[PDB]
Design a binder for this molecule. Structure first.
Ligand SMILES: O=C1CC[C@]2(CC(c3ccccc3[N+](=O)[O-])=NO2)C(=O)N1
Ligand SMILES: [Zn+2]
Length: 108
């Protein structure tokens, strides 16, 4: 009866990811970054996610991860901005960077 195994959208409950899918990119699953507007994000990297809607085509502009292009990842249910999908890189080619405090963790 694990209580901390699934991540859901904090706004609506959409199933998004799993603790088992956390990915230590450069040795840590947690990365703290700012966008050009100075907004701080505490980002968890996941090998896999579901329930998102990836918006538009990838961009390398101001990418926080060397060699990856990003696409905005909304909650596919409620449209909450949950993070980014990264692609175009190497080992791995793709991953998800999700904003920790926009998810809720709970039982399967
Ligand atoms: O890895 C990333 C993804 C999020 C982003 C990219 C970004 C941005 C940069 C240029 C144009 C538009 C956007 N946007 O997210 O809408 N703002 O924050 C950033 O700085 N780095
Ligand atoms: Zn949602």
């Amino acid at each position: 009866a694990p209580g901390a195994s699934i991540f859901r959208c904090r706004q609506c409950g959409q199933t998004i990811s799993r603790r088992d899918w956390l990915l230590p990119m450069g040795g840590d699953h947690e990365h703290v970054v700012f966008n050009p507007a100075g907004m701080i994000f505490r980002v968890w990297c996941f090998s896999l996610a579901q329930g998102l809607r990836l918006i538009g085509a990838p961009s390398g502009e101001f990418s926080w991860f060397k060699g990856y292009d990003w696409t905005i990842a909304l909650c596919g249910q409620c449209g909450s901005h949950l993070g980014w999908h990264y692609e175009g890189g190497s080992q791995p080619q793709t991953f998800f960077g999700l904003i920790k405090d926009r998810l809720a963790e709970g039982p399967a």
